[PDB]
């Protein structure tokens, strides 16, 4: 009723994360998987439960894939399970803050709004995007008012990644740029690499990835630490040990070295084209606050690599323009930052926002859907 | 009970109290509306923007100038700008202070009376008077005769006066101003290769114009030099950082003012229309008008404009008739200085048109108590 | 011994001779070298994304292929005219004339403006022409066989932009064509299944309420996709540049302001004669929609709500099945007309002296 604490939920191809507001850490994080088979056939499970299942004959499937809902029935089953078993909450006496990708269509948006307002008899609902919340999660205090809003967010979801040049809380609809990499494709590539030489499938792949996969400013000028010191050949075990080799050194370079798996353009060039397509009087700020997000983005030296690449590209372009003109310009300053938020910045930003009282007003009321119907929200 | 003034020119509103040597609010007169819908909650996201805020966050907000060529077009935006000026910058309630206004000659009586009506019915001002943006420049200069040439961002007019007696039949007006110059500059830049089509890019082009643009005596000689050598190619940086170079365009732009045939208009230049206006008056006062002609308002701060105008008017007029231009450095605020002086004067008080007169006689009174 | 015609376009290129109604050859400018109709896999360039040229060497290769493979002539002196946007930077035409005068003679070219070319093609002497190509569009008025040169308008949204927006919409739906290939297939499906909405609200309500308007289109690989509101939406993204990300009034309002900027005594003669050119203008329902938009804009801006005299407007838009090659037909007609006198052209001579300045003889 706008007085209790609002619930923050975020579904995803890789991990669904749900919890409450006014918290420093999220709650109920788990990989977003469901498992099922007088007669009802209603025995099902989700999350780590479903993962541990399938030993007694329980099927498995991923509701959402490629960043777009596919089965509203299973999605509603999943929401019902997570809302009536994991969280003992009441959907009526609490407001809901849902997040959807910038590419979510109005059909799916209104389907979710209806299945939430009607079946769960909710009271207040607010659908938003991940870009603005991930950006808001960048600053630390959030009250000094010296924060910045103009930024260039890049979210690498476990299934798909994309980039948005936000400017003063005004999202862009054209300069948006997606890419199907930076997700389970890296895991599949590392698995295919491992299955070639060492037969001993994907669980260990993602484990060793999150454990040791890092980047390097170069590869061919690199590979030298490997040729010299065998110490890089770590030994990871699950059930026996496995030779890492060079997966930890090659996997993340898929971004800066595309067209290695199932073509695309490197990330620096992509973000440069995005910033150029955007208006001119906002690039000086867009290049300044470049925040990241998504687990697949929280690599070891991702920020330094991207910053160096984009800086050298912009410097080459400006030097071309200069030597063509003859004057001397002021070298634009590019910066990157990731302060213990790129992992789950979306939920942190959502909660920080919901903490405001204006959330209760910006939400949608049940009577609104009752009188207007399912055509309330159309597009951002 | 000190009076104030607010010159609402097509380029920027200059608002300030009276009895002062310089104004306080020098803020641009533009209204910006967000292109997108906006989703942030609790961080601005206002439905409109006005003043320096627009010029700052212009890369998203679509801009609009409410008044064009001196006539108002968007009364809602105009009253919004007036509210922002009175309640944010000046930080004063006009209910206890009069408000002197300004307007260009040969403007719609409907526009003037609507301005008066809105100012009287919305702000509850006690009195409200208007005047020309040229007699004020004359007062600021401190003279009592001569011809005055204003070239505001919206219009460009010239008016003679002798000992305080105006000559309406000699007044001249033209719609050429800085906006057409900026459009021609954008066109010639596209000719060069640089493209500028949006509103923020229009403001950037206007800034370039204010920064580096001059005039010369021999336009053909300057064109030949620019086409032969590169001593005129000047560099300029942009917020993106990619510097650019511009050649003869910097001085080819004002040739529109000096040769409207470039943009398409058929009327003559400022020199020819000034000569015609002077010729419309009597010779006994022409003799003096030629000796003291003042420039005011924007679009004339270009360097070298004095020499070109002097040569042109001298070639168009006899030689024995001496000619002297008056182009001080304090011209962009000359109209405001004149308004402040007139408001501070004593007799002018009796000319203030109050609330009861308008309430009992209607707006039509403004066409009699004023010029 | 007659001159040649070559209206080098954004993505397409059409060539013939000094007098030929229908173009003898037409092929995409997509790109040993594969320049030509061999596109039917090497690198894909698409040099002329807009009226500008980027890979001048690839353009030279394309012209060589066109003159040696599609055509069997390699002369030095045979006049050949050209086409270009109205305000195309001087550097582009300068480099073009330089390469065509150095690598070949081609004494006398006299590049011209697609607007006046199409006007010649239609055999007119007054009216406004709105060319809508693939990378750029322009608007040019004319009165009593005279050009204004100060109300000409340019607009850099057409073709490629609508294709990119359709790709983004199909991505929103789920189908992705991120590959460099399939661009031609998306172009084909656009030119095949697309039409402007005479009533946008009506079409939106229909698409939201009915299952009709949803079509199934096959692909060369074999799979099938479904198309919906995008069909009637892409002409809206053409009509509403703000949707694409550009800050411009559009097309109807653009031409309305362009005409209003002219003299009253000409305005009428412009509302009575309006021609189009370019494949992008062949969108179904575009002419009548534009006419209705112009009528509404007039009703709003001028009459402010007085429909008593609206019928006394007399607007007559023009359209034909040959707008796809109107520029070519006009270039051919002009070449046949000017093939007699060589003074109007720019011979291979008088080039080293002040060649670049000779190009200023056309546009003062």
């Amino acid at each position: 009723a706008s007085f209790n604490v609002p619930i923050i939920m975020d579904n995803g191809t890789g991990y669904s994360k749900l919890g409450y507001a006014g918290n420093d850490a999220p709650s109920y994080v788990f990989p977003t998987v469901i498992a099922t088979r007088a007669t009802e056939d209603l025995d099902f499970f989700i999350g780590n439960d479903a993962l541990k299942k399938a030993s007694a004959g329980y099927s498995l499937d991923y509701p959402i894939r490629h960043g777009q809902i596919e089965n509203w029935d299973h999605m509603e089953r999943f929401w019902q399970q997570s809302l009536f078993k994991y969280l003992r909450c009441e959907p009526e006496d609490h407001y809901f803050l849902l997040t959807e990708p910038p590419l979510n269509p109005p059909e799916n948006r209104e389907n979710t709004a209806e299945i939430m307002f009607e079946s769960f008899n909710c009271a207040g609902l607010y659908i938003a995007v991940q870009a603005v919340l991930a950006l808001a999660a960048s600053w630390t205090s959030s009250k000094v008012t010296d924060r910045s809003l103009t930024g260039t967010v890049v979210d690498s979801g476990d299934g798909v990644t994309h980039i948005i040049p936000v400017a003063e809380g005004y999202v862009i609809g054209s300069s948006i740029k997606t890419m199907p990499l930076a997700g389970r494709d890296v895991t599949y590539f590392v698995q295919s690499l491992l299955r070639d030489r060492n037969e001993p499938s994907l669980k260990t792949a993602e484990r060793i990835k999150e454990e040791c996969c890092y980047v390097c400013p170069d590869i061919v000028k690199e590979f030298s630490r490997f040729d010299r010191e065998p110490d890089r050949y770590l030994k990871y075990a699950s059930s026996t040990t496995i030779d890492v080799g060079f997966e930890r050194f090659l996997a993340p370079e898929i971004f800066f070295n595309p067209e290695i798996a199932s073509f695309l353009t490197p990330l620096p060039e992509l973000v440069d084209n995005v910033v150029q397509s955007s208006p001119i009087d906002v690039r000086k700020g867009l290049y300044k606050n470049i925040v990241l997000s998504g687990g697949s983005t929280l690599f070891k030296n991702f920020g330094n690599r991207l910053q160096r690449d984009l800086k050298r590209i912009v410097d080459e372009r400006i030097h071309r323009s200069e030597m063509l003109s003859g004057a001397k310009s002021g070298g634009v300053d590019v910066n990157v930052i990731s302060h213990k938020r790129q992992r789950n910045a979306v939920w942190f930003g959502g909660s920080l926002l919901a903490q405001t009282p204006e959330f209760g007003s910006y939400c949608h009321t049940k009577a609104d859907y009752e009188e207007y119907g399912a055509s309330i929200a159309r597009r951002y | 009970t000190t009076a104030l003034v607010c010159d609402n020119g097509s380029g920027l509103v200059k608002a300030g109290f009276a009895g002062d040597d310089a104004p306080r609010a020098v803020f641009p007169s533009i209204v910006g509306r967000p292109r997108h819908q906006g989703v942030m909650v609790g961080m601005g996201q206002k439905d409109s923007y006005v003043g320096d805020e627009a010029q700052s966050k212009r890369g998203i907000l679509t801009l609009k100038y409410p008044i064009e060529h001196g006539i108002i077009t968007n009364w809602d935006d105009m009253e919004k700008i007036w509210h922002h000026t009175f309640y944010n910058e000046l930080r004063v309630a006009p209910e206890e202070h009069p408000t002197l206004l300004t307007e260009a000659p040969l403007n719609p009586k409907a526009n003037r009376e609507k301005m008066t009506q809105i100012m009287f019915e919305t702000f509850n001002v006690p009195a409200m008077y208007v005047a020309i943006q040229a007699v004020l420049s004359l007062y600021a200069s401190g003279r009592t005769t001569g011809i005055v040439l204003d070239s505001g961002d919206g219009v460009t007019h010239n008016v003679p006066i002798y000992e305080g007696y105006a000559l309406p039949h000699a007044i001249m007006r033209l719609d050429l101003a800085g906006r057409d110059l900026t459009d021609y500059l954008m066109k010639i830049l596209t000719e060069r290769g640089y493209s500028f089509v949006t509103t923020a890019e229009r403001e950037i082009v206007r800034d370039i114009k204010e920064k580096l643009c001059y005039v010369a005596l021999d336009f053909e000689n300057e064109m030949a030099t620019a086409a032969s050598s590169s001593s005129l190619e000047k560099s300029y940086e942009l917020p993106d950082g990619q510097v650019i170079t511009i050649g003869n365009e910097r001085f080819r732009c004002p040739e529109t003012l000096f040769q409207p045939s470039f943009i398409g208009m058929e009327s003559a230049g400022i020199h020819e229309t000034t000569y015609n206006s002077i010729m419309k008056c009597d010779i006994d006062i022409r003799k003096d008008l030629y000796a003291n002609n003042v420039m005011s308002g924007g679009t004339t701060m270009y360097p070298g404009i004095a020499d070109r105008m002097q040569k042109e008017i001298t070639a168009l007029a006899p030689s024995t008739m001496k000619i002297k231009i008056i182009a001080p450095p304090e011209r962009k605020y000359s109209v405001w200085i004149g308004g402040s002086i007139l408001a501070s004067l004593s007799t002018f008080q009796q000319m203030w048109i109050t609330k009861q007169e308008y309430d009992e006689a209607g707006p039509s009174i403004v066409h009699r108590k004023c010029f | 011994s007659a001159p040649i015609v070559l209206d080098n376009g954004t993505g397409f290129v059409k060539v013939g001779y000094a007098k030929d109604n229908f173009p003898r050859f037409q092929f995409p400018s997509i790109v040993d070298v594969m320049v030509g109709d061999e596109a039917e896999l090497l690198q894909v360039k698409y040099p002329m994304e807009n009226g500008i040229i980027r890979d001048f060497e690839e353009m030279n290769q394309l012209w060589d292929y066109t003159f040696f493979e599609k055509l069997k002539i390699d002369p030095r002196g045979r006049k050949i005219l050209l086409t270009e946007p109205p305000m195309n930077p001087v550097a582009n035409r300068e480099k073009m004339c330089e390469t065509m005068f150095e690598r070949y003679g081609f004494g006398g070219v006299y590049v011209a403006i697609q607007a006046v070319l199409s006007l010649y093609a239609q055999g007119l002497s007054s009216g406004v022409v709105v060319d809508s190509g693939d990378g750029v569009t322009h608007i040019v008025p004319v009165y009593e066989s005279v050009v204004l040169n100060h109300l000409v308008g340019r607009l850099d949204v057409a073709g490629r932009d609508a294709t990119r927006y359709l790709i983004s919409l199909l991505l929103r739906k789920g189908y992705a064509f991120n590959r460099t290939a399939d661009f031609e297939t998306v172009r084909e499906m656009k030119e095949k299944l697309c039409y402007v909405s005479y009533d946008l609200e009506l079409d939106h309500k229909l698409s939201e309420e009915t299952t009709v308007l949803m079509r199934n289109y096959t692909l060369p690989d074999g799979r099938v996709i479904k198309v919906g509101s995008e069909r009637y939406e892409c002409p809206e993204c053409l009509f509403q540049p703000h949707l694409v990300g550009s800050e411009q009034p559009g097309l109807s309002e653009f031409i309305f302001d362009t005409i209003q900027a002219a003299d009253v005594d000409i305005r009428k003669y412009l509302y009575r004669a309006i021609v189009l050119s370019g494949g992008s203008s062949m969108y179904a329902g575009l002419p009548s929609r534009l006419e209705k938009e112009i009528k509404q804009l007039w009703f709003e801006r001028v009459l402010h709500g007085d429909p008593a005299r609206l019928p006394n407007f007399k607007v007559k838009i023009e359209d034909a099945p040959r707008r796809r090659h109107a520029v070519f037909i006009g270039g051919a007609v002009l070449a046949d007309i000017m093939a007699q006198n060589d003074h109007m052209w720019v011979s291979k001579a008088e080039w080293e002296e002040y060649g670049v300045r000779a190009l200023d003889k056309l546009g003062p």
Binding site: - | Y194, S195, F196, V197, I244 | E49, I52, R54
Partner: peptide, 7 residues
Amino acid sequence: PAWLATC
């Protein structure tokens, strides 16, 4: 993009 500045 190919105008040496804007677009």
